[PDB]
């Protein structure tokens, strides 16, 4: 399971890194 280097949130392979960046590191 992948940890994010910025927030240390774990995501599974059924949600991509670029989706993490949009949802959790942009403006909701």
């Amino acid at each position: 399971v992948y940890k994010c280097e910025i927030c240390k949130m774990p995501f599974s392979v059924y949600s991509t890194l670029e989706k993490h960046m949009k949802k959790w590191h942009s403006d909701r």
Partner: nanobody
Amino acid sequence: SGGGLVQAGDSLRLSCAASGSTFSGYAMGWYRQAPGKERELVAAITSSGASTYYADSVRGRFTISRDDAKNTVYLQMNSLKPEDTAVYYCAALDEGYLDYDSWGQGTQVTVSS
């Protein structure tokens, strides 16, 4: 109101507040430094407040919330376990990796059983 020393089953509520409106437009997260481990993201909340993350260990028990008007973020901690013992911090998710030094001060929570 005295300190963070409590016993299991007890509940506590943490707040993190800053001057101005800095937390607005940023997702916020509660972090903890338990003895032995590195940072753990315990809970997070998107910028709008529409979405929410919880670490497995605390899911069901902890609750995160934000009030951009007061520039304040909250973590309601029910049913504390001894494994919840740590220093707690809040930060911008864009800053979760920065040195503890550049973060705020942090509060101990110390659970007993």
